Ligand binder design. Structure first.
Ligand SMILES: OC[C@H]1O[C@@H](O[C@H]2[C@H](O)[C@H](O)[C@H](O)O[C@@H]2CO)[C@@H](O)[C@@H](O)[C@@H]1O
Ligand SMILES: OC[C@H]1O[C@@H](O[C@H]2[C@H](O)[C@H](O)[C@H](O)O[C@@H]2CO)[C@@H](O)[C@@H](O)[C@@H]1O
Length: 309
């Protein structure tokens, strides 16, 4: 597999966003400014809490199917390859990594089987869309740290996705969990959220390399990035990290990440986090402390590296 020059798009989307010219212009700008060749379309169903079993993808927080297909087909007309990544958020704000249920089934308690039935229904729905739009890859889950232990259920979900979708299937594990996932053999591509501290790449790449060398499968950091915030370079996953604005630190983080991984032949690409559907004005880039790179020094670092690969 070719090196994946990717960027995550659409995380901010709601119903109706993708039908707009504003969405299509942001995607073209993403391509023009970063030289990305893949777009990761990240979508979020909702559940009420980390311990609820109903995964809701029908409310207006979700783009509808028609406009999702339209955006996908538009991205292909730009020459982009498409990775579809449907995940889930909690309405009360809990990180999805905490989604958890009792190990055993307790009468009256919510159970893994109930949650997985709802989650599978959601994933099969989007697996069918990925199939009819010929998405190059499908991501069955994202950073589901506590749920990763239910290996039987994840294998069942992947089998169900294979009935709908012929392309590459991956699972997006969280930072530091690459060596804990027990079902990589059921997937075509190994992937993780590579939010590693700016000063700990050597150790982490050594750890991940040993996992990857056990399989005949490409690996890539399907999510990776850093907010323009002081303190973020050490904790780049922490989207709610309290710190003052710092665009220099964000660009530093990207320069180190690329320099460290460029020499590791098995690091197969990135899905950088993230490019908003409805972008801030470029004249406000210098006051923005979010993950975005539009108008920021990190934008130049990314374009230069992507064009060199
Ligand atoms: O895509 C156009 C149709 O959308 C439908 O809503 C869906 C939506 O596609 C998506 O599947 C979402 O997650 O669930 C929604 C409600 O079922 C309907 O709005 C339908 O009328 C549209 O033709
Ligand atoms: O879930 C809503 C928040 O997402 C955040 O991005 C996370 C994303 O959930 C996922 O974990 C990805 O792998 O990393 C991103 C950065 O940590 C932010 O977009 C935040 O603004 C949202 O509230």
């Amino acid at each position: 597999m070719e090196f994946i020059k990717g960027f995550t798009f659409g995380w901010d989307s709601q119903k109706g966003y993708f039908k707009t010219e504003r969405a299509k212009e942001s995607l073209r700008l993403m391509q023009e400014r970063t030289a990305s060749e893949y777009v990761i379309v990240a979508l979020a169903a909702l559940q009420d809490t980390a311990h609820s079993t109903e995964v809701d993808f029908q409310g207006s927080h979700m783009v509808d199917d028609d406009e999702l297909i339209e955006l996908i087909d538009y991205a292909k007309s730009l020459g982009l390859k498409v990775i579809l990544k449907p995940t889930v958020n909690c309405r009360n704000g809990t990180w999805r990594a905490h989604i958890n249920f009792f190990d055993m089934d307790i009468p009256g308690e919510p159970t893994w089987d109930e949650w997985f039935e709802s989650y599978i229904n959601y994933q099969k729905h989007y697996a069918k869309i990925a199939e009819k739009t010929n998405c190059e890859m499908f991501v069955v889950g994202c950073e589901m740290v506590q749920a990763e232990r239910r290996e039987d259920k994840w294998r069942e979900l992947i089998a169900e996705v294979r009935k709908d979708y012929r392309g590459l299937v991956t699972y997006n594990t969280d930072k530091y969990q690459e060596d804990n996932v027990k079902f990589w053999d059921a997937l075509d591509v190994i992937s993780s959220s590579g939010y590693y501290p700016i000063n700990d790449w050597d150790r982490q790449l050594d750890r991940i390399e040993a996992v990857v060398k056990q399989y005949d499968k490409p690996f890539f950091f399907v999510a990776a990035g850093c907010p323009s915030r002081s303190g973020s370079a050490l904790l780049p996953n922490k989207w709610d990290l309290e710190g003052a604005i710092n665009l220099q630190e964000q660009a530093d983080y990207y320069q180190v990440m690329f320099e460290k991984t460029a020499s590791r032949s098995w690091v197969g690409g990135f899905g950088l986090w993230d490019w908003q559907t409805y972008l801030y004005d470029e004249k406000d880039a210098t006051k923005n402390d979010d993950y975005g790179v539009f108008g920021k020094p990190a934008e130049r670092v990314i374009k230069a590296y992507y064009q060199s690969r």
